[PDB]
Design a protein around this ligand. Sequence first.
Ligand SMILES: [Mg+2]
Ligand SMILES: [Mg+2]
Lengths: 111, 112
Amino acid sequence: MGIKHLNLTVADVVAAREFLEKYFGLTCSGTRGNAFAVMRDNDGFILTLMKGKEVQYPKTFHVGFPQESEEQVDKINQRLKEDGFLVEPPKHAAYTFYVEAPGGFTIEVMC
Amino acid sequence: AMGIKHLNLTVADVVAAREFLEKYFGLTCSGTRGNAFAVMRDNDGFILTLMKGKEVQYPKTFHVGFPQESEEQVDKINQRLKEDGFLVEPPKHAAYTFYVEAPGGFTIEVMC
Ligand SMILES: [Mg+2]
Ligand SMILES: [Mg+2]
């Protein structure tokens, strides 16, 4: 089954969880207080969030959330910008942009 | 008296109601029992539990209201619901209000 789990250490589990729910439609299947949250997508990928920052992720590190259309990429970009997150217009290579998620890791959004 | 702090809202589909409330209204799920039950919380500690039921119907004028800090915020939720395929009309000055038929089979009011 290849790669199906990522344990992402973050600065703030609650903030990272709510961001992923709002913008990326992940679902939470469990928590241990504010220390731990288990997030799932539709395909059974498990992305656990774990408190305890000592260090920043390498700057090129990112997690990618593909979208069904360029319109959907634009929509997420727009709403992030409106909601106070620091984003720039997506670029055509895939049609792609990046955002820093609360918690302290970069997300790639693309079609 | 400490007032009103819980609603048990019977729904047709807990999963669908939960995800809608998370996406559009920022509620947080604090627990589930399978697909039958979910405990949702708002920022002020109100507890909204969603409970699967059969043949769920509410009186026509029943609704749950989510007040907003500004009329611009009302517009934003309206616009996003519309773009995302929910049937909403523009908000009206009656409070500045609109309604939406929510997943799970109940009406939500959004106002300032
Ligand atoms: Mg990449
Ligand atoms: Mg009302």
